[PDB]
Write an enzyme that holds these catalytic residues in place. Structure first.
Site, PDB file in Angstrom:
ATOM      1  N   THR A   1       0.816  -1.133  -0.134  1.00 43.96           N
ATOM      2  CA  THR A   1      -0.021  -0.173   0.008  1.00 43.96           C
ATOM      3  C   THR A   1       0.930   1.206   0.008  1.00 43.96           C
ATOM      4  O   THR A   1       1.683   1.238   0.892  1.00 43.96           O
ATOM      5  CB  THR A   1      -1.034  -0.192   1.045  1.00 43.96           C
ATOM      6  OG1 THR A   1      -2.133  -0.932   0.662  1.00 43.96           O
ATOM      7  CG2 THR A   1      -1.533   1.254   1.553  1.00 43.96           C
ATOM      8  N   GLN A   2       0.621   2.040  -0.822  1.00 38.96           N
ATOM      9  CA  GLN A   2       1.678   2.841  -1.575  1.00 38.96           C
ATOM     10  C   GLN A   2       0.917   3.873  -1.886  1.00 38.96           C
ATOM     11  O   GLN A   2      -0.181   4.079  -2.231  1.00 38.96           O
ATOM     12  CB  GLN A   2       2.350   2.256  -2.849  1.00 38.96           C
ATOM     13  CG  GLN A   2       3.617   1.433  -2.669  1.00 38.96           C
ATOM     14  CD  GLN A   2       4.967   1.718  -3.254  1.00 38.96           C
ATOM     15  OE1 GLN A   2       5.059   2.625  -4.084  1.00 38.96           O
ATOM     16  NE2 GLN A   2       5.870   0.976  -3.103  1.00 38.96           N
ATOM     17  N   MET A 107       0.213  -6.966  -2.065  1.00 40.53           N
ATOM     18  CA  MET A 107      -0.364  -5.675  -1.755  1.00 40.53           C
ATOM     19  C   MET A 107       0.594  -4.606  -1.558  1.00 40.53           C
ATOM     20  O   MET A 107       0.333  -3.669  -0.831  1.00 40.53           O
ATOM     21  CB  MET A 107      -1.220  -6.009  -0.542  1.00 40.53           C
ATOM     22  CG  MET A 107      -2.407  -6.847  -0.826  1.00 40.53           C
ATOM     23  SD  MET A 107      -3.520  -6.157  -1.883  1.00 40.53           S
ATOM     24  CE  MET A 107      -4.334  -4.908  -1.079  1.00 40.53           C
TER      25      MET A 107
ATOM     26  N   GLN I   1      -6.031   4.604  -1.404  1.00 41.75           N
ATOM     27  CA  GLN I   1      -5.920   3.125  -1.234  1.00 41.75           C
ATOM     28  C   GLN I   1      -5.570   2.459  -2.486  1.00 41.75           C
ATOM     29  O   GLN I   1      -6.460   2.355  -3.498  1.00 41.75           O
ATOM     30  CB  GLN I   1      -7.011   2.425  -0.401  1.00 41.75           C
ATOM     31  CG  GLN I   1      -6.533   1.679   1.285  1.00 41.75           C
ATOM     32  CD  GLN I   1      -6.282   0.023   0.626  1.00 41.75           C
ATOM     33  OE1 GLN I   1      -7.128  -0.673   1.089  1.00 41.75           O
ATOM     34  NE2 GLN I   1      -5.032   0.017   0.373  1.00 41.75           N
TER      35      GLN I   1
ATOM     36  N   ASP L  91       6.817   3.822   3.329  1.00 43.01           N
ATOM     37  CA  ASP L  91       5.707   3.832   4.316  1.00 43.01           C
ATOM     38  C   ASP L  91       5.780   4.367   5.490  1.00 43.01           C
ATOM     39  O   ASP L  91       5.115   5.178   6.071  1.00 43.01           O
ATOM     40  CB  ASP L  91       5.039   2.530   4.266  1.00 43.01           C
ATOM     41  CG  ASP L  91       4.695   1.842   2.906  1.00 43.01           C
ATOM     42  OD1 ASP L  91       4.779   2.505   1.948  1.00 43.01           O
ATOM     43  OD2 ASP L  91       4.784   0.582   3.092  1.00 43.01           O
TER      44      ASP L  91
END
Ligand SMILES: [Cl-]
Ligand SMILES: [Cl-]
Ligand SMILES: [Mg+2]
Ligand SMILES: [Mg+2]
Ligand SMILES: [Mg+2]
Lengths: 233, 125, 4, 196, 222, 204, 195, 212, 222, 195, 4, 196, 4, 4
Positions: A1-2, A107, I1, L91
């Site tokens: 998830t980026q 993902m 997302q 992230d």
């Protein structure tokens, strides 16, 4: 998830009678800020393949490194590394497609859309696309981003089906590609004037042109446009 | 983990560690089982070089595995506790999943299987 | 509702 | 958008790029963001195209009616009418407006009206997304009482930079010159301003 | 949809494809997206189908009344102003995206109107889902000083880009030509490049195939 | 919670040689529960026929409304309303409720009694007119109806042929939708006789 | 609220309606009559949102009684049902709609036929041989599809209803505390006292 | 779905419909919702088409291994408990199943277990399962006697599925029928509702709600 | 997302005759309102006289087909070159799909070939591996348009014997390959007319005891 | 699940537990025994999340039976209750906790006393003269506060329980289909067959 | 995926 | 923050403001955002104070270990180690870093590493919240091969402007000079740079 | 919507 | 948290 940070816009491409052309501008945007201007987004692999990349630039640089490592690895214990066991465009593509689909499946995608352009060893033209979802497809013309919306309709006017490829010279096709790049500069708010272009010909090999510019622009009519409806002066 | 292959074959095709385990059984106090028409009886010798024993609390030699099955043995006493516990656990687990207590054959086959496993696993006798 |  | 207005010796100049956006698509590359609300009172529009047009149309209408009853309105008055609209409808409006005009008493004047509908009278003003990139430049290069040619250059160079860095700015640079001599429209194309 | 407008020497021309969609489904293969506001002012509309029809008729009605009241031929800028102020009042909820064109005593005009109420002026314009395909063609072939026949070709070429390359557009090309001093000519189905091929088989059934429970004559009379 | 598919049902209409046909199913349900097997969705006002799919309460309301409006039309105009005109009245009336609409998919069919022309049309819930040579479809099995019609249909069918074709489009579409079916009615409409046939169909 | 049924036989309409009134984890009452007489040959049962149900029923009753006095005449069941439907159809687009479902059972004296109308809170009206609102229908419709015949007597109707109540007492999660049954026929409206 | 199974004097009846839906889309009218696990064991399917099909054919493999290892057919109780212990492991993962495990053994007699994906396992004489369960229950309950003839039982089962197929939008296609006895299960045919409804309406005089 | 799925459109269709079976699919590939390719095949010869299509999200479709082809390879390696029967392929594919029950392949899968008695067979799968043999199946975007046509024209549903009072059904019967190709071609031209994601080209793979033949036909490109 | 009660009198512990099993709008079963014998003088009733209840009960039963076989001895009620509490107290912090509430009724033969333990799914244990889980307690605790005496006979206990079940059948929203009653005393565990 |  | 690094005739200069914020509160007015990872390889830190410190500490550690085994690392190598950290932990990191160093072969070099962990080699680089306001200025005033004094002036004037407009920049201007002659720390106070 |  |  980026989420993509520094990004590259359209990559456009087509087949002609003897080869393939592919182009992409030299910009790395940072949202609406046109942050970086000397960014090469076409990466040649050997002398028979160019890989053009849009999307996140940090992931593009990662992919560069994978490709440069792949060349190295292919030379290992390979006395025909610059001959019958040189990397083909179809090998380079499938490798990338494999990685893209695995990363989507974990993902954690590589936030890119990729076009692999080149000529196979039997002289066949190779043009195929893969993106962050691992979706792949082939067509006589291919483009990413705004390119898909604005370049494809223009390039398909030249090559609309398989049979149109023999009929298309490299001068004709380069014209179409260069014109398509101008349009994108008119209309894509995240394009730059400067770009690179590469031809992979089954006879002349790889020609890689840097520092091209969009030229012969029509802006003159702008002077005649006054107001937004009723205003005169 | 400790890995050594302790139960291995000898040139004549014997597994000496299994055969020596049999010797340990031979040295154990005697046990006998006789089945009647409608009962089964389990008899066990207790070696009598021991007075001052407390029989209330000393581990008896016949063990209930479930309320319808008993097990007795000859050999190493400490070894037998391990088999009895495993057998007791399996008896409860069989009731839980099959909704029926074990057959005597089933429970025997299980204990036997445990014994066999210890003849071709590394690091155990 | 249809669009165009 | 990248817009600005600059006062100088003989009056005031307004300048703007010509780009309208619909996301990252350029809906119009030759937009006219410099709008007339009276003979020598003009505005630069940024923010919502619909909001700013609707506002300018109403202001033009008020000032036409003002003119009929009381003669030529001052630039200050025009800015006040923009404010009233922007302030009172601040919840529903996305409009960043610069007002610029030429009196014969007051010479050149610039009023800037940011999002909340506050008013600020300044020697010059810059606004629009592209303006962020030229605060440094403009503060370093602006002086008072520049000549017409110096002021055209200041605006040309400033908007050149805003257009260079801002993806939401581009096309041609338009200017509107406001002096005692009348009203002059200038236009400069990419091949000129880009390589400055 | 795809729609365009292109000015030329003596006037202005507009064109539109003819597909209507309800999600992925083609609701209408041949609807008319060209609307007459007044005899020499025509409108092409994309967006919510009912909205473009309704807003176009309402303003057409008021323009007629205004033309009668003033004893003048209607101007495009009046349609423009009335449309834009109506759409603005509705804050975008009336989903009409329009290219307005026509000729009037002032000359020939070309405008676009987005649903929130902003207007644009140009020599060539396109709107709708097909607008990027069309605009690519317009940016490629448009020039200053087009003849009427060049303008028609350019317009329908731009619509064709939409038909072939946009899934939101298909079927036919409608055109309307508004030249100064002449009647508007409305060219319904100017191009029809998507004629269904002959089917392989006729599915006409043996009579009596369908099981019936009851009949009766319906009384439509008085 | 999607009002257009709480009750279920469908309507289809087709043109033929000097005739039109319009058909509907008879189901009225509350989600999974079938409630009534006699809920017709086609109505007429003189010689103009209107089918309405969608939320049943609105179907009923709109029928009552268009009866009202056409009765007054007849009294003032001294003639029966024609299909082209009724189509326009339907459109006006729906668009008048633009930001609080009736959740319906109406369909109009009939023959213009001056010109003899067969005429069909369909509408979205806010009044958009879809005029068509061939067929109009509506309801929860509309995808299926589009498929059936687009393959089964051919121009210029005789009334008894058109009957078979429209019936087969309806039946086979209904059978692939859980919310449509439970019976069906077909109207064959010629310039001045109208036959109404109830179809035999699977009751699940 | 919860359980309301109706069956129309040869010569009458029978309405059965649960007696329980429950709020939270307490059954506050076990003798609730979920019905209002609209006119001497028309009866209406109701179920739905607390408060809304009685307020709606009494409001319709007041309107129908007013009409009766005004014209010295009894509105037909079909007419009353259409009035009720319109009221609900308006309501569904109000600031706060009535969340009430009804069954209207009446004997039409001009036709000499019994009639049963089922109307939900959206204003969805249907005439039926037998009807139910809420979860009740999920057991009874199929049962009645099986056992019901068009020409049954009032006694046959009540036995058929015993079947429905029995099934609901076997399979329903809640204790609805039995039903009050009422018969509408050519002689008016009466209540069965032992069910 | 609608599925049922009930015990009686003459063994067990098992009857199911054959419809699969995705929303309102009728995906198939020809699903085999009974799985024949062994000649004395049946499983019924309701819920997720894949979940049911997969785990119930997996169940059959597990029952086969029991009889190889134990030289004996698996008890209904133990077969049902394999399935229920399996789904209980997946509790919360979103499996969707409502199944009945139906069979005869000498030690048990004819036996039915209801097993669902929340991990509920119940022994009982009557169950109906699926979106149409309540419709089936209504008919079934109001005609059920322990003493029904085999002939009557078969019909009641078939008729109960018909009832549900008619009223429940998500049930339909055809009825599949089984009878289970001390000698195993016997198939009693596939019955299209297409023709069965009209046949039952005519012969029985029921379904008067419907335009004849 | 990040959303790991996409939708590439297209549609597929399988019909089975007495001694043959066909698996057809259009050759258009799309995302949103753009065409990616007008010729990107999605029906594949998998060896052992089995053809397979997995329509929906192409990346998942390709992964699955790849895995099954590979499964056929190893079936030969492990079981002495034995032929993989269609029923066995079907069951293997169920396990491939259900193995990803908690992160599914977003595809509708159809395979076609010949059963062990030489009769034509079609199997279809939901995305997580429910499966069933049929005469007949359409899948993908236009499935809902084509399937009911097939119920009517392949299995003769709602069709009765004329004059038998709707009491005697049209009797079932196998179709010639010539008849089947007619229904396929009509199915796809109809689907192309009314669905925006279907068009460009049609590729049919026919499977008989002499192997796999292909046929190709142009479809409308709008 | 839903209704489980327990009362401890002079010489025994009585457990009453509802028979209904309901899923959706269907009562699937009306003869469910919501209890497991843990040892010959210890009984456990349970209510909570579907599946979890039986899985938990049978798992405890398997553990206690194993202990009995291993030591040829019966664990005291206090000991069993503490084992059960610990299991629930661990569970409450697992990835997926057991959502089960229990009553443990036992006759301690060393003390010659009956004992009743109430334990919720969090592992909250309390010894009580009378106990209940779920909404049941909201009627019975007060009723029992009134009518219960410490020295009651088993017969007095059952009458007191009739009072509790009567009240619950009067005021509870749901039909729980009666209770199965079981007595735990010096002679073991038995079931009353007509309640 | 379907349900049953 | 406002930060930048500029190559010139004799090497490279790094500059930065000295403000750390905790909302609109200035937690530290004399911060040192220019950090050593090797004798003549330094970095400018922007973004999270904790993230950038943790990163610089790890990089210093890697390069100390590099040095022990293989001698002096190149500036390119140092930038690569920053990248690896920033890219692989994109992230969880809010770090915008400029790397600058002096080789004797390569003279001055500047690598900028924005949020996603991409690498960009440039003649000069600017970054931090305050950098937006000086894109115009810096693009207009930078030339290659400036002298030390010219480069100090360029940096002083640029950061002066960034500090003027950006509320998240302020305090003193720090610089670090990197040549063959060694390492020089400069500091300029508000009373000097403010009124430039 | 169009911005500037 | 402290930013720069
Ligand atoms: Cl504008
Ligand atoms: Cl710091
Ligand atoms: Mg049904
Ligand atoms: Mg198209
Ligand atoms: Mg500051």
């Amino acid at each position: 998830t980026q989420q993509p940070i520094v990004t590259g816009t359209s990559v456009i491409s087509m087949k002609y009678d003897n080869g393939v052309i592919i182009a992409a501008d030299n910009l790395g945007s940072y949202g609406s800020l046109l942050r970086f201007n000397g960014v090469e987004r076409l990466i040649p692999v050997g002398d028979n393949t160019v890989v053009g990349i849009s999307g996140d630039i940090s992931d593009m640089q990662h992919i560069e490194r994978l490709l440069k490592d792949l060349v190295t690895e292919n030379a290992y214990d390979n006395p025909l590394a610059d001959a019958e066991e040189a990397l083909e465009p179809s090998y380079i593509f499938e490798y990338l497609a494999t990685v893209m689909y695995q990363r989507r499946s974990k993902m954690n995608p590589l936030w890119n859309a990729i076009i692999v352009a080149g000529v196979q060893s039997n002289g066949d033209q190779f043009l195929r696309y893969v993106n962050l979802l691992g979706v792949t497809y082939s067509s006589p013309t291919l483009a990413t981003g705004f390119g898909a919306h604005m370049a494809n309709p223009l390039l398909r006017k030249v090559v609309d089906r398989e049979s149109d490829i023999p009929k298309t010279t490299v001068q004709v096709a380069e014209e179409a590609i260069v014109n398509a790049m101008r349009v994108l500069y008119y209309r894509d708010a995240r394009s730059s004037r400067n770009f690179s272009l590469a031809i992979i010909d089954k006879n002349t090999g790889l020609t890689f042109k840097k520092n091209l510019q969009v030229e012969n622009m029509k802006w003159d009519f702008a002077k005649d446009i006054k107001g937004y409806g009723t205003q005169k002066i | 983990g400790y890995d050594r292959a302790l139960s291995i074959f000898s040139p004549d095709g014997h597994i000496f560690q299994v055969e020596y385990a049999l010797e340990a059984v031979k040295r154990g106090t005697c046990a006998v089982g006789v089945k009647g028409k409608n009962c089964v009886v389990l008899g066990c010798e207790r070696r009598s070089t021991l007075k001052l024993q407390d029989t209330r609390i000393t581990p008896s030699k016949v063990s209930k595995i479930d309320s319808h099955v008993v097990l007795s043995f000859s050999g190493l006493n400490a070894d037998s506790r391990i088999l009895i516990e495993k057998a007791r656990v399996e008896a409860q687990s069989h009731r839980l999943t099959l909704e029926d207590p074990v057959t005597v054959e089933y429970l025997t086959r299980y204990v036997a299987g445990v014994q066999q496993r210890y003849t071709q696993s590394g690091g155990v006798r | 509702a249809x669009l165009x | 958008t990248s817009i600005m207005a600059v006062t100088f010796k003989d009056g005031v100049i307004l300048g703007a790029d010509s780009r309208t956006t619909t996301g990252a698509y350029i809906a119009n590359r030759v937009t006219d963001k410099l709008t007339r609300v009276h003979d020598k009172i003009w505005c630069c529009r940024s923010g919502s195209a619909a909001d700013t047009q609707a506002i300018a149309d109403i202001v033009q209408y008020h000032l036409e009616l003002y003119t009929s009853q009381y003669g030529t309105p001052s630039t200050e008055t025009a800015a006040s009418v923009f404010k009233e609209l922007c302030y009172e409808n601040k919840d529903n409006l996305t409009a960043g407006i610069i007002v610029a005009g030429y009196d014969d008493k007051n010479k050149g004047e610039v009023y800037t009206i940011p999002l909340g509908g506050s008013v600020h009278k300044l020697p010059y003003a810059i606004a629009g997304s592209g303006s962020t990139f030229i605060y440094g430049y403009c503060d370093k290069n602006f002086r008072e009482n520049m000549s017409k040619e110096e002021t055209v250059d200041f605006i040309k160079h400033s908007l050149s930079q805003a257009i260079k860095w801002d993806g939401s700015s581009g096309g041609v640079i338009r200017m509107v010159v406001l002096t005692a001599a009348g009203v002059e429209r200038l236009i400069f194309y990419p091949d000129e301003y880009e390589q400055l | 949809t795809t729609i365009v407008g292109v000015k030329f020497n003596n006037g202005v021309v507009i064109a539109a494809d003819t597909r209507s969609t309800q999600g992925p489904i083609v609701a209408d293969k041949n609807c008319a997206k060209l609307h007459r506001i007044s005899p020499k002012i025509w409108c092409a509309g994309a967006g919510t189908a009912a909205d473009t029809e309704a807003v176009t008729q309402l303003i057409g009605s008021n323009i007629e009344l205004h033309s009668l009241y003033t004893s003048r031929e209607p101007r495009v800028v009046s349609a423009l102003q009335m449309l834009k102020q109506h759409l603005f009042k509705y804050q975008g909820h009336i989903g009409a995206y329009l290219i307005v064109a026509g000729v009037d005593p002032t000359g020939s005009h070309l405008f676009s109107i987005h649903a929130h109420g902003s207007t644009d002026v140009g020599y060539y314009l396109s709107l709708g889902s097909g607008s990027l395909a069309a605009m690519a063609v317009l940016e490629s072939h448009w020039k200053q000083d087009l003849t009427k026949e060049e303008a028609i070709k350019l317009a329908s070429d731009a619509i064709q880009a939409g038909i072939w390359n946009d899934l939101g557009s298909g079927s036919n090309v409608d055109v309307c030509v508004m030249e100064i001093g002449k009647d508007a000519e409305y060219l319904r189905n100017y191009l029809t490049p998507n004629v269904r091929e002959e089917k392989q088989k006729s599915y006409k059934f043996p009579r009596g195939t369908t099981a019936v429970l009851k009949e009766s004559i319906v009384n439509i009379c008085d | 919670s999607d009002p257009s598919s709480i009750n279920g049902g469908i309507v289809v209409a087709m043109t033929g040689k000097d005739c039109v046909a319009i058909a509907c199913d008879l189901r009225l349900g509350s989600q999974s529960l079938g409630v009534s097997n006699k809920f017709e969705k086609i109505f007429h006002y003189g010689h103009v026929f209107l089918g309405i799919t969608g939320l049943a309460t609105d179907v009923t309301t709109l029928n009552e409304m268009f009866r009202y409006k056409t009765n007054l039309y007849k009294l003032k105009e001294e003639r029966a309303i024609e299909p082209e005109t009724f189509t326009q009245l339907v459109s006006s009336s729906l668009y008048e409720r633009r930001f609080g609409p009736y959740f319906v998919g109406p369909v109009v069919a009939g023959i213009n009694s001056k010109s003899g022309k067969p005429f069909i049309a369909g509408f979205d819930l806010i009044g958009c007119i879809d005029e068509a040579k061939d067929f109009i479809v509506s309801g929860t099995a509309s995808d299926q109806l589009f498929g059936m019609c687009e393959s089964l249909y051919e121009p210029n069918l005789e009334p008894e042929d058109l009957f078979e074709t429209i019936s087969q489009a309806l039946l086979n579409a209904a059978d692939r939708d859980a919310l449509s079916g439970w019976g069906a009615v077909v109207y064959i409409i010629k310039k001045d006789e109208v036959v109404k046939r109830y179809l035999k169909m699977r009751q699940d | 609220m919860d359980i309301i049924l109706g069956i129309r036989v040869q010569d009458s309409v029978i309405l059965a309606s649960s007696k329980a009134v429950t709020r939270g984890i307490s059954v506050l009452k076990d003798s609730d009559d979920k019905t209002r007489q609209l006119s001497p040959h028309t009866l209406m049962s109701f179920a739905g949102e607390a408060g809304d149900t009685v307020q709606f029923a009494e409001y319709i009753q007041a309107n129908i009684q007013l009409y009766s006095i005004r014209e010295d005449y009894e509105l037909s069941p079909q007419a009353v049902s259409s009035f009720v439907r319109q009221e609900l159809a308006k309501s569904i687009r109000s600031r706060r709609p009535y969340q009430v479902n009804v069954l209207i059972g009446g004997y039409d004296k001009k036709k000499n036929k019994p009639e049963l109308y089922q109307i939900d809170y959206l204003g969805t009206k249907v005439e039926l041989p037998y009807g139910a609102h809420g979860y009740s229908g999920f057991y009874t419709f199929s049962l009645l599809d099986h056992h019901y015949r068009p020409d049954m007597t009032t006694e046959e109707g009540l036995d058929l209803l015993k079947l429905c109540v029995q099934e609901l007492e076997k399979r329903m999660p809640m204790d609805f505390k039995g039903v009050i049954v009422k018969i509408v026929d050519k002689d008016g409206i009466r209540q069965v006292d032992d069910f | 779905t609608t599925t049922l199974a009930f015990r009686f004097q003459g063994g067990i009846i098992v009857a199911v419909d054959s419809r699969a839906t995705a929303g309102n889309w009728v995906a198939s009218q020809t699903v085999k919702k009974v799985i024949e696990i062994n000649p004395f064991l049946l499983g019924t399917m309701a819920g997720g088409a894949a979940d049911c099909q997969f785990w119930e054919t997996w169940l059959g493999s597990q029952c086969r291994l029991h009889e190889l290892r134990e030289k004996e057919r698996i008890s209904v109780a133990a077969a049902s408990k394999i399935l229920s212990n399996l789904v209980y492991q997946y509790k919360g993962a979103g499996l969707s199943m409502g199944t009945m495990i139906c069979g005869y053994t000498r030690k048990e007699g004819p036996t039915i277990y209801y097993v669902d994906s929340d991990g509920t396992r119940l022994k009982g004489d009557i169950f109906c399962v699926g979106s149409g369960q309540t419709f089936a229950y209504g008919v079934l309950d109001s005609n059920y006697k322990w003493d029904l003839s085999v002939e009557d039982a078969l019909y009641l089962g078939k008729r109960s599925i018909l009832a549900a197929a008619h009223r429940d939008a998500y049930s339909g296609g055809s009825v599949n029928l089984y009878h289970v006895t001390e000698d195993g299960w016997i198939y009693h045919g596939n019955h299209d509702v297409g023709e069965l409804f009209w046949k039952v309406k005519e012969e029985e005089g029921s379904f008067n709600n419907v335009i004849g | 997302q990040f959303n790991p799925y996409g939708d590439n459109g297209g549609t597929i269709l399988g019909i089975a005759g007495e001694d043959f079976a066909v698996l057809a699919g259009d050759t258009r590939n799309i995302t949103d309102y753009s065409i990616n390719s007008r010729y990107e095949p999605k029906v594949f010869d998998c060896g052992d006289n089995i053809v397979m299509s997995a329509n929906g999200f192409a990346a998942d479709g390709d992964a699955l087909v790849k895995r099954f082809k590979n499964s056929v390879k190893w079936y030969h390696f492990d079981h002495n070159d034995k032929k993989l029967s269609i029923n066995s392929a079907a069951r293997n594919i169920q396990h491939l799909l259900y193995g990803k029950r908690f992160f599914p392949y977003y595809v509708h899968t159809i395979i076609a070939g010949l059963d062990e008695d030489g009769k034509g067979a079609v199997y279809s799968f939901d995305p997580v591996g429910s499966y069933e043999r049929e005469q007949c199946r359409a899948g993908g975007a236009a499935a809902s348009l084509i399937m009911p046509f097939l119920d009517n024209q392949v299995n003769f549903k709602n069709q009765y014997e004329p004059g038998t009072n709707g009491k005697v059904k049209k009797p079932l019967k196998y179709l010639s390959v010539e008849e089947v190709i007619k229904l396929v071609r009509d199915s796809f031209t109809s689907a192309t007319e009314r669905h925006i994601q279907v068009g460009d080209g049609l590729e049919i793979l026919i499977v008989t005891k002499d192997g796999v033949r292909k046929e190709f036909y142009e479809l409308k490109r709008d």
